[PDB]
């Protein structure tokens, strides 16, 4: 396969990317949500799709296992984006990185413990507020951590706030806005520009 490999994740990124792909002449031939398969052809024989965990999208793209991909800004910040090119803000899967804690709970008298999957972002954010914190790395369900006393605050993505409210948590600080971004492998950009360019141009047009 000499064409382009596009890395996407299931759920909202796949759902919100499909219209952009359609407008660019690229449609999946089945629903990846209902398949155990991971590589999918498209209506365009020069483009195939990898379905990955969101956290693996930057990894595949960086290493050139995919030529390009759609990754949340949150994942990019956490992973590090210095070995891919971020070409477009697609303005999909929009949310924000925030700190949160138990509603009205005071902070304890010591170095704070932050429970989060976004360990690098958490460290950098608290450092920008003048604080060195301990970070506890979690892989899921951040909202539970404050309720059982694992960490004093969490760092997580918030959209509606329903998850925080359902668990008696409140957002404390706004870290940054997050949206999904189009990222490209630095070599693929140079060597497969002829294939990439119309798709990138289509995406840019669609997001206007």
Ligand X SMILES: O=P(O)(O)OC[C@H]1O[C@H](OP(=O)(O)OP(=O)(O)O)[C@H](O)[C@@H]1O
Q: Is 72 helix (H, G, I), strand (E, B) or coil?
A: strand
Locate 28 and state its tokens.
Answer: 């999946």
Q: Establish if 11 lies at the interface with ligand ADP (CB under 6 A).
A: yes
| Nearest-angstrom CA–CA distance, 115 and 138 | 6
Question: Rg of the chain's alpha carbons, rounded to an integer?
Answer: 19
Q: Of 169, 41, 177, which is closest to residue 97 (Cα–Cα)?
A: 177
**Contact call for residues 69 and 183 (beta carbons, < 8 A):** yes
Sole binder of a second copy in the list 13, 138, 183, 196 (CB under 8 A):
138
How many Cβ atoms are within 10 Å of 10's Cβ, its own excluded?
13
Total residues contacting ligand X by CB under 6 A comes to: 8
Q: Which x/- pattern, by CB under 6 A, does the window 70-89 give for ligand ADP?
A: --x-xx--------------
**Binding flag, residue 183, ligand ADP (CB under 6 A):** no
Note whether 119 binds a second copy by CB under 8 A.
no
Stretch that binds ligand ADP, among 7-15, 21-29, 62-70, 120-128 (CB under 6 A): 7-15
Q: Which is nearer to ligand X, 15 or 159 (CB)?
A: 159
Residue 165 tokens read as 């409210």
Applying CB under 8 A, the residues found at the interface with a second copy are 5, 36, 38-39, 50, 52-53, 55-56, 59-60, 63-66, 136-141, 143-145, 147-150, 166
């Amino acid at each position: 396969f000499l064409g382009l490999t596009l890395a996407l994740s299931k759920g909202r990124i796949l759902e919100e990317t499909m219209p952009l792909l359609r407008a660019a002449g690229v449609e999946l031939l089945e629903d990846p949500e209902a398949s155990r398969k991971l590589i999918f052809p498209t209506s365009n024989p020069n483009v195939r799709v990898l379905i990955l965990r969101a956290s693996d999208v930057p990894t595949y793209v960086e290493h050139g296992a995919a030529d390009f991909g759609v990754a949340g800004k949150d994942v990019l910040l956490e992973h590090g984006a210095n070995h891919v090119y971020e070409l477009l803000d697609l303005k999909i899967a929009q949310c924000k990185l925030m700190t949160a804690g138990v509603k009205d709970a005071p902070l304890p008298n010591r170095r704070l413990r932050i429970a989060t999957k976004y360990v690098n972002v958490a460290r950098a954010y608290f450092a920008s507020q003048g604080q060195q914190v301990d970070v506890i790395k979690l892989y899921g369900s951040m909202e539970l951590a404050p309720l059982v006393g694992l960490g004093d605050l969490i760092v997580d993505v918030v959209d509606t706030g329903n998850t925080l409210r359902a668990n008696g948590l409140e957002a404390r600080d706004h870290i940054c806005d997050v949206s999904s971004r189009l990222i490209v492998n630095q070599v693929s950009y140079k060597r497969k520009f002829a294939l990439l360019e119309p798709i990138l141009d289509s995406f840019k047009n669609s997001i206007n």
